[PDB]
mmCIF file of C-alpha atoms and ligand atoms in Angstrom:
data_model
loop_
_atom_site.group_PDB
_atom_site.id
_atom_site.type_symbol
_atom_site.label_atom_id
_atom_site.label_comp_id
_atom_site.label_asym_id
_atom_site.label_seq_id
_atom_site.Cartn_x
_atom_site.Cartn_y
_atom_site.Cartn_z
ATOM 1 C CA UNK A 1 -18.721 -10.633 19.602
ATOM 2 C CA UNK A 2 -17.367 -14.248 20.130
ATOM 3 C CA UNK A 3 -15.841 -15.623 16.897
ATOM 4 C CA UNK A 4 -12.366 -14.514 16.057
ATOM 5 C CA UNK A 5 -12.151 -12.067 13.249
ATOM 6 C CA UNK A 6 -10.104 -13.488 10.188
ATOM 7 C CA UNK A 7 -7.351 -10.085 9.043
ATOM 8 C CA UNK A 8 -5.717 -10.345 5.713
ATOM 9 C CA UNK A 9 -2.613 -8.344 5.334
ATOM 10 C CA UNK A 10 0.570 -8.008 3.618
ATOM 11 C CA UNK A 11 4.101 -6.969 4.265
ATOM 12 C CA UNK A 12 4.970 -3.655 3.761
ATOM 13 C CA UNK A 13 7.225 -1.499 5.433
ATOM 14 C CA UNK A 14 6.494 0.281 7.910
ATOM 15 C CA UNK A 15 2.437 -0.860 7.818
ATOM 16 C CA UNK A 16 3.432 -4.459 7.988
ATOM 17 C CA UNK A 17 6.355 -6.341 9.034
ATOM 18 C CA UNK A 18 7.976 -9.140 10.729
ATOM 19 C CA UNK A 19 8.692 -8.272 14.787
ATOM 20 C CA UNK A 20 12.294 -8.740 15.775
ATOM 21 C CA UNK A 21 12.508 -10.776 18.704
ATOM 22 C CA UNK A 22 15.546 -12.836 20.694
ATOM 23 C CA UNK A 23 12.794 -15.178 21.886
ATOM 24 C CA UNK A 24 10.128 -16.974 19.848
ATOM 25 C CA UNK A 25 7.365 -14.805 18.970
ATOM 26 C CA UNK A 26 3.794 -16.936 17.671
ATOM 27 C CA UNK A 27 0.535 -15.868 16.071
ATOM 28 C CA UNK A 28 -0.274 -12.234 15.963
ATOM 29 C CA UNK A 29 3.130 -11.503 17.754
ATOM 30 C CA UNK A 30 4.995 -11.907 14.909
ATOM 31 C CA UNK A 31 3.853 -9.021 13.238
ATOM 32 C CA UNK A 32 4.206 -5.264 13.922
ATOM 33 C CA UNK A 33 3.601 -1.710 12.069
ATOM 34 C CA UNK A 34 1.361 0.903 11.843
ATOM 35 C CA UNK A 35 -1.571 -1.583 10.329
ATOM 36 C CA UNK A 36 -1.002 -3.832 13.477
ATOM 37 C CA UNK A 37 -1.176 -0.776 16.173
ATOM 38 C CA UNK A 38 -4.472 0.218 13.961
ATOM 39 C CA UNK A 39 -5.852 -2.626 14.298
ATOM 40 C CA UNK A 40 -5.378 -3.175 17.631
ATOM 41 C CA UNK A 41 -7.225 0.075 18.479
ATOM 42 C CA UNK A 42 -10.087 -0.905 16.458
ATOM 43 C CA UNK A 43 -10.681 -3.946 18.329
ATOM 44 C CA UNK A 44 -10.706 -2.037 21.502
ATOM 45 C CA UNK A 45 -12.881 0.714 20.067
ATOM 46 C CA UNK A 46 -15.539 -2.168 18.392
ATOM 47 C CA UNK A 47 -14.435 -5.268 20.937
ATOM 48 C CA UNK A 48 -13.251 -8.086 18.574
ATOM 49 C CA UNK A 49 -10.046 -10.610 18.792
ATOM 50 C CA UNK A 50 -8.574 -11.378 15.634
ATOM 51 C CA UNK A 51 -6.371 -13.898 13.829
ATOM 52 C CA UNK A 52 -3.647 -12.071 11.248
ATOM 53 C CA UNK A 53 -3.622 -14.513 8.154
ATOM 54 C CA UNK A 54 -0.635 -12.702 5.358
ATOM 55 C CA UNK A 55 -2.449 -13.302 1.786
ATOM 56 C CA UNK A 56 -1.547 -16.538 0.585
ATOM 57 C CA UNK A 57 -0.186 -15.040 -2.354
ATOM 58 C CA UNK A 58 1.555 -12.306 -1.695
ATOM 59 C CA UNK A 59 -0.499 -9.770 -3.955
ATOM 60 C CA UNK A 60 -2.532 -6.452 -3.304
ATOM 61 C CA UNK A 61 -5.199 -7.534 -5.532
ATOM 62 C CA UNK A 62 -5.895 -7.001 -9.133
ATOM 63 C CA UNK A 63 -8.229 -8.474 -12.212
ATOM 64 C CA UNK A 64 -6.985 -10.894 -14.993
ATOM 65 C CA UNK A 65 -8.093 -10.248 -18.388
ATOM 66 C CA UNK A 66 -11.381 -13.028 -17.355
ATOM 67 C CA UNK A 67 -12.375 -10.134 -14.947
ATOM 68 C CA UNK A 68 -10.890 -12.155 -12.145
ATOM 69 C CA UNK A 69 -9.830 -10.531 -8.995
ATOM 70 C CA UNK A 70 -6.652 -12.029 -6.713
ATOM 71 C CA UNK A 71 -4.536 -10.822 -3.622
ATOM 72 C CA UNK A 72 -6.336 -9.432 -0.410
ATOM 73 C CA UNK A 73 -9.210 -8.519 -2.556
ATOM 74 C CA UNK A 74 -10.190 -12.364 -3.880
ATOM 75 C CA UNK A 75 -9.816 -13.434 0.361
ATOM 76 C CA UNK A 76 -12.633 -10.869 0.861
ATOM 77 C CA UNK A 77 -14.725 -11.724 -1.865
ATOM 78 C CA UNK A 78 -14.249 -15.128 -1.386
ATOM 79 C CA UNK A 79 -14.960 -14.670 2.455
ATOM 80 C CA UNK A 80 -11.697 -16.122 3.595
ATOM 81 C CA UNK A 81 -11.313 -13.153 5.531
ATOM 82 C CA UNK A 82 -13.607 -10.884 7.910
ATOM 83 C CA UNK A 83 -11.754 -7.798 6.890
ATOM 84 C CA UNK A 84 -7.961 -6.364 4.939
ATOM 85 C CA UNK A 85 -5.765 -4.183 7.520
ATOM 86 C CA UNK A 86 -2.980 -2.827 5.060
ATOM 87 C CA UNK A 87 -2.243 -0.069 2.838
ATOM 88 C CA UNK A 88 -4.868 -1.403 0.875
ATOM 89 C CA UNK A 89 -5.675 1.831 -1.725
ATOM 90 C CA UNK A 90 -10.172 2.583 -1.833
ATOM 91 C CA UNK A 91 -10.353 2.375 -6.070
ATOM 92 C CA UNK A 92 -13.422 2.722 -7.963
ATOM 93 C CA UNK A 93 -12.844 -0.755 -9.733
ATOM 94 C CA UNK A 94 -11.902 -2.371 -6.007
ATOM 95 C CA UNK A 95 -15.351 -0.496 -4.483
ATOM 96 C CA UNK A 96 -17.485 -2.953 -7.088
ATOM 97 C CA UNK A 97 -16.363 -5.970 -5.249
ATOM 98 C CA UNK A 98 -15.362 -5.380 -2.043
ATOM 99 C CA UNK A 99 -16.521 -2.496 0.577
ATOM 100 C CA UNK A 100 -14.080 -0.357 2.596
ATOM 101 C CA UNK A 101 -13.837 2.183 6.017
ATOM 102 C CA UNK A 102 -13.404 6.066 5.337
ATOM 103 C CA UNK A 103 -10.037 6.102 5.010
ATOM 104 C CA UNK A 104 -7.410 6.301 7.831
ATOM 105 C CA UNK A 105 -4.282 7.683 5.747
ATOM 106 C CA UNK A 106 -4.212 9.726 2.392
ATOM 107 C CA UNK A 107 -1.829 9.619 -0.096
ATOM 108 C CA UNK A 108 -0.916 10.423 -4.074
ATOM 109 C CA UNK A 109 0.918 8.494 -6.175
ATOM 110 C CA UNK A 110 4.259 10.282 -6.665
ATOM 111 C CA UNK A 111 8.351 9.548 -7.752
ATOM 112 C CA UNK A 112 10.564 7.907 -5.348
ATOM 113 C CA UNK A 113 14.459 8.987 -7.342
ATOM 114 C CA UNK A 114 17.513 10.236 -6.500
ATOM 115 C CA UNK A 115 18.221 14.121 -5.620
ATOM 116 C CA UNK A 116 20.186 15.967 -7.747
ATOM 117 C CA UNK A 117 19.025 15.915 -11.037
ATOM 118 C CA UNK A 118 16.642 17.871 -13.795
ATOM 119 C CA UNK A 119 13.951 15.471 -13.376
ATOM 120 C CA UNK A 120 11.075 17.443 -11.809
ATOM 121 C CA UNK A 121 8.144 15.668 -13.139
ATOM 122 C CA UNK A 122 6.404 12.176 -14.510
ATOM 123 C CA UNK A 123 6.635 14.771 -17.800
ATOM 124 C CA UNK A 124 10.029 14.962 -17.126
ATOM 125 C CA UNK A 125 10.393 10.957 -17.198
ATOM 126 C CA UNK A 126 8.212 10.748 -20.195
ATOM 127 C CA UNK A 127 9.857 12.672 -22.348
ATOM 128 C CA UNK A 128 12.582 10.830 -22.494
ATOM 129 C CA UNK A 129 14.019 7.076 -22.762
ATOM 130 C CA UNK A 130 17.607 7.059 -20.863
ATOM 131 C CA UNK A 131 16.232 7.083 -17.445
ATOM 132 C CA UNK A 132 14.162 3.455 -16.409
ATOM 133 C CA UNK A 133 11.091 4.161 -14.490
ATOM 134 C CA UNK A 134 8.239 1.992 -13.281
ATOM 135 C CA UNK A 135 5.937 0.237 -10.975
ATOM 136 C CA UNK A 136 5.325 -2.446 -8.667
ATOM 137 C CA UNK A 137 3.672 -5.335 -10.692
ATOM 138 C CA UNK A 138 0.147 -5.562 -10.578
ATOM 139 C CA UNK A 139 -1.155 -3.159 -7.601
ATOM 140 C CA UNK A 140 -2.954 0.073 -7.848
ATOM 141 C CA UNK A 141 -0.030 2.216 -9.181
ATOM 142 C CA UNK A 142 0.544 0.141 -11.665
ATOM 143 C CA UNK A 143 -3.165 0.146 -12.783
ATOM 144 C CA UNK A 144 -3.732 3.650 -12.757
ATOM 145 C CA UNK A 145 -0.904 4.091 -15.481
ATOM 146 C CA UNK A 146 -2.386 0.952 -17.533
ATOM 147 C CA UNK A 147 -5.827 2.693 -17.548
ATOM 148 C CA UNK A 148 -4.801 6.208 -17.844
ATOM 149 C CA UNK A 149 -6.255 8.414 -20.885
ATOM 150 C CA UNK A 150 -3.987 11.336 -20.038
ATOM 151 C CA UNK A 151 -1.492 11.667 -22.398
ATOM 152 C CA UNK A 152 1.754 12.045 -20.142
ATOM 153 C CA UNK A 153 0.687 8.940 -18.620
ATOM 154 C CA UNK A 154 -0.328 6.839 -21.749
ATOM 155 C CA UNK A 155 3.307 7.434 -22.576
ATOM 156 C CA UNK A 156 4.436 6.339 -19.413
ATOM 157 C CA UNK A 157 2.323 3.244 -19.610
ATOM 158 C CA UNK A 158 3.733 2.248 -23.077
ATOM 159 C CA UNK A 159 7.229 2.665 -22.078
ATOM 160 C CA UNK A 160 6.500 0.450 -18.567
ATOM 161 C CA UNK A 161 4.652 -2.293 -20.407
ATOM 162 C CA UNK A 162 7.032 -2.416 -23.712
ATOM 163 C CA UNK A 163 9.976 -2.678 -21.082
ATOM 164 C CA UNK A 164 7.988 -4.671 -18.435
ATOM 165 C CA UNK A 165 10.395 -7.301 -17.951
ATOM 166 C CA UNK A 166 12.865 -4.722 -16.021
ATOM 167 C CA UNK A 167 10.873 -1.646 -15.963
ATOM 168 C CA UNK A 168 7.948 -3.122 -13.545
ATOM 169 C CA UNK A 169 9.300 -5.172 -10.653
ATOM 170 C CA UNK A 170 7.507 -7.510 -8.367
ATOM 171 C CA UNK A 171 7.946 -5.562 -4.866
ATOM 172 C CA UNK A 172 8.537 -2.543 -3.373
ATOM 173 C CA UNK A 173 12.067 -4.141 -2.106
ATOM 174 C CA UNK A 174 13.049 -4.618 -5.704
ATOM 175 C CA UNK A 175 11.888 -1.480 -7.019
ATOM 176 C CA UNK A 176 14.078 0.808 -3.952
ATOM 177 C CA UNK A 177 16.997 -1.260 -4.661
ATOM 178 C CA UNK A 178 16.558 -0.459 -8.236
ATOM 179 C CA UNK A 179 16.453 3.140 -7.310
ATOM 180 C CA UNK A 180 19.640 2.762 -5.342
ATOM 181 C CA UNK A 181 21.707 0.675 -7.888
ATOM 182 C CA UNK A 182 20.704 1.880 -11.426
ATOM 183 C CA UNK A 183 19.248 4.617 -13.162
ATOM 184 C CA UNK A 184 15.567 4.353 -12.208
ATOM 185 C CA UNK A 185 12.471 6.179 -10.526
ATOM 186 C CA UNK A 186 9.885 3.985 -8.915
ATOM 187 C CA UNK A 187 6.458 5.614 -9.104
ATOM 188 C CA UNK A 188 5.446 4.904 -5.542
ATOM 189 C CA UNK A 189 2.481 6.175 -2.974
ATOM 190 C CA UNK A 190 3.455 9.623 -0.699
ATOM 191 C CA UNK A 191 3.174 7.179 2.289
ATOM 192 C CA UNK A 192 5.405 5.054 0.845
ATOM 193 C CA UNK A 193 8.018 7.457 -0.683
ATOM 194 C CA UNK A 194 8.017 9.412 2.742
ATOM 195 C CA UNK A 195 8.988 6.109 4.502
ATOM 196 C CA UNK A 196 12.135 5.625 2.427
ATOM 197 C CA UNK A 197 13.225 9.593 2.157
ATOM 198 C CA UNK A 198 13.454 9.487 5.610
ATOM 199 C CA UNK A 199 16.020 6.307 5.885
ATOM 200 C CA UNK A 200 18.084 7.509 3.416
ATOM 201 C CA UNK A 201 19.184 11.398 2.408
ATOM 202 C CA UNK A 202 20.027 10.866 -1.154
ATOM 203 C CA UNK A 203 16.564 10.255 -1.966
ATOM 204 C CA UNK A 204 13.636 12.188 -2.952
ATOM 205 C CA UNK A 205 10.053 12.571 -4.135
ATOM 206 C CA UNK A 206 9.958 14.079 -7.517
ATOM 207 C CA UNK A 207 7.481 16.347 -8.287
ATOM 208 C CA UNK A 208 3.713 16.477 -6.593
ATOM 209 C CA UNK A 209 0.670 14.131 -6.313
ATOM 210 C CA UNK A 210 -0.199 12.556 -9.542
ATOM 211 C CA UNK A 211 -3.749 11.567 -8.130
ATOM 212 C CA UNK A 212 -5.556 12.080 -4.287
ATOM 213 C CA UNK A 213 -6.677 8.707 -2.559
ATOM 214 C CA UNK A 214 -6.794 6.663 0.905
ATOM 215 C CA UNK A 215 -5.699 3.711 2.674
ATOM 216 C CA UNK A 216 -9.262 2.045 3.728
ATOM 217 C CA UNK A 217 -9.829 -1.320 5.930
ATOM 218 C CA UNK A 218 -11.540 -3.357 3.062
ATOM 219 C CA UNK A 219 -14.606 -5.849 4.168
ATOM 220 C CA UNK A 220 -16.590 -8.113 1.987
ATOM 221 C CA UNK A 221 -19.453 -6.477 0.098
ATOM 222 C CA UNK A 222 -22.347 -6.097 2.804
ATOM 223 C CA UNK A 223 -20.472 -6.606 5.707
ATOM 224 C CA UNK A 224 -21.952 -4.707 9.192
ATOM 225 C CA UNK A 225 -18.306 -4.092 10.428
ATOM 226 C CA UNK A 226 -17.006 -1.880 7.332
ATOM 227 C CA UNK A 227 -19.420 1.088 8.829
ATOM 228 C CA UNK A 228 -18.333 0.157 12.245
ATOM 229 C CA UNK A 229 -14.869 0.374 11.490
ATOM 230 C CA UNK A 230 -14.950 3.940 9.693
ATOM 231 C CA UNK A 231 -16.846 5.017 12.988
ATOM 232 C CA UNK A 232 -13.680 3.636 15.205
ATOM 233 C CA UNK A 233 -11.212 5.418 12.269
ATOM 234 C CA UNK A 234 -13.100 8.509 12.987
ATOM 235 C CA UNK A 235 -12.799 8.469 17.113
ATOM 236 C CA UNK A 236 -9.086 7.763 16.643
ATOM 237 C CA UNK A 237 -8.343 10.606 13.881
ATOM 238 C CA UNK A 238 -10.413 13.297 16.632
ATOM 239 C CA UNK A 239 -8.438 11.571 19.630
ATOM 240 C CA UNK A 240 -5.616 12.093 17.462
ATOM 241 C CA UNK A 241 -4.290 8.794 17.794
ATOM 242 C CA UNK A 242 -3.661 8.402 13.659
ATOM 243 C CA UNK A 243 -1.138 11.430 14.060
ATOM 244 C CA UNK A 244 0.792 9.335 17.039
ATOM 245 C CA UNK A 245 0.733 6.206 15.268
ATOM 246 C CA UNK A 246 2.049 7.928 11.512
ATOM 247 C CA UNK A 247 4.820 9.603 13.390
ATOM 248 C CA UNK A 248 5.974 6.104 15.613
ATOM 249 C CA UNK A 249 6.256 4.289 12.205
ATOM 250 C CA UNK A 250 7.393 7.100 10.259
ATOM 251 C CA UNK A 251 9.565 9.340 12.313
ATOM 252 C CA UNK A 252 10.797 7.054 15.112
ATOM 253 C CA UNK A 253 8.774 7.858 18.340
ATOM 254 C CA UNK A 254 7.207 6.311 20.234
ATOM 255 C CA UNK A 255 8.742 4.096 20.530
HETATM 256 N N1 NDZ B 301 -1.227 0.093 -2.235
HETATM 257 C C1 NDZ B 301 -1.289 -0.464 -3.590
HETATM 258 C C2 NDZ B 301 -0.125 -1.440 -3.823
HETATM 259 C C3 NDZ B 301 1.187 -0.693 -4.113
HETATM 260 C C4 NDZ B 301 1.055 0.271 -5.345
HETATM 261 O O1 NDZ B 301 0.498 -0.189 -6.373
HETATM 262 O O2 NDZ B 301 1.516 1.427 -5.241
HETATM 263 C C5 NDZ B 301 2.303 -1.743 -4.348
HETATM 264 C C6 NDZ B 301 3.509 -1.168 -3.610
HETATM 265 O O3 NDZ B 301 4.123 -0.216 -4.504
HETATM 266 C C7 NDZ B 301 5.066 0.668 -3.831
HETATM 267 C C8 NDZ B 301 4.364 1.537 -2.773
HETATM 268 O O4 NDZ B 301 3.419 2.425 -3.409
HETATM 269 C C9 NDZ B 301 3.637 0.644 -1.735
HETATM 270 O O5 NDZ B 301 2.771 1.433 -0.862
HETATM 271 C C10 NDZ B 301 2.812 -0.486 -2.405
HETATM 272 O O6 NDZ B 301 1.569 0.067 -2.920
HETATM 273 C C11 NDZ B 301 -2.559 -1.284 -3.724
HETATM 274 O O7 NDZ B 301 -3.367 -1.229 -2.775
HETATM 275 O O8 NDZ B 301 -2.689 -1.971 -4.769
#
């Protein structure tokens, strides 16, 4: 309990984000979000200090066709960092190479779209080719509908990858204002979706939970503090301090 754990995160609203500020914020100060107030209370609960690195570039983590992993995943593997602090989703193929906490947040992968229309399901979308939908390039959404065997989703997958060069976009940003500008769904996480419904009143999730997963803190493979950590997660989900900090960042307070 002396060296200064290394975080790797990533923006994402509201986990992650830049802290507005009239004066110069430095280091840690310039981020805030739910991942930041999370990880303060785990360095209380297991008594660490930390230096917040973003991944250097920019991706969640997924393999190339070699088998080769990037994003927050390759600085773990790699032991460039001591542990991942973002909505970082626990996946079978992810668990191989890198080890996470329980997890601190569940979620499905759903529809962000607009209200007021027939679409109730992914079905719904598949069946037809007027309506654009997609995923954010290269992250675990994205990969569930790549490897899918279910039919439904198969069909999805061919549609998203035979239009990839509009129908997958390279951030959640792009993907909302997509939503908002043309006629698109984003397949998105619950978290996620829930986030954006909130801001704005002509949006909606479409339909239920198209699979049942978690947010996890992600260590390298073997690392003491991954058990550690799901012990801390644990004391703050019976303190109830997980419900507080989802409603700050999703709701509004507090603050
Ligand atoms: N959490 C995912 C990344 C991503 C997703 O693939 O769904 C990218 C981005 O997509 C939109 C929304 O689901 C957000 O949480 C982000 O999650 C992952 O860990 O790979």
């Amino acid at each position: 309990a002396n060296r200064t754990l290394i975080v790797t995160t990533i923006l994402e609203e509201p986990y992650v984000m830049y802290r507005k500020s009239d004066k110069p914020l430095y280091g840690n100060d310039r981020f805030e979000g739910y991942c930041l107030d999370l990880l303060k209370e785990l360095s209380n609960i297991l008594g660490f200090i930390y230096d917040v690195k973003l991944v250097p570039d920019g991706k969640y983590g997924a393999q190339n066709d070699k088998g080769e992993w990037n994003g927050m995943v390759k600085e773990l593997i790699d032991h460039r960092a001591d542990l991942a602090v973002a909505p970082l989703t626990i996946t079978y193929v992810r668990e191989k190479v890198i080890d996470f906490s329980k997890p601190f947040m569940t979620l499905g992968i759903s529809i962000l779209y607009r209200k007021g229309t027939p679409i109730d399901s992914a079905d719904d979308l598949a069946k037809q080719t007027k309506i654009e939908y997609g995923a954010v390039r290269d992250g675990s959404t994205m990969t569930f509908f790549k490897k899918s065997k279910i039919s439904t989703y198969e069909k999805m997958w061919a549609f998203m990858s035979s239009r990839q060069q509009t129908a997958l976009v390279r951030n959640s940003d792009e993907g909302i204002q997509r939503v908002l500008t043309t006629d698109y769904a984003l397949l998105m996480e619950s978290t996620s979706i829930e986030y954006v419904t909130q801001r704005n009143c002509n949006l909606t999730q479409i339909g239920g939970l198209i699979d049942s997963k978690g947010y996890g803190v992600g260590t390298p493979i073997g690392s003491p503090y991954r058990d550690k950590i799901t012990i801390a997660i644990l004391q703050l989900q019976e303190e109830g301090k997980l419900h507080m900090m989802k409603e700050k960042w999703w709701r509004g307070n507090g603050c």
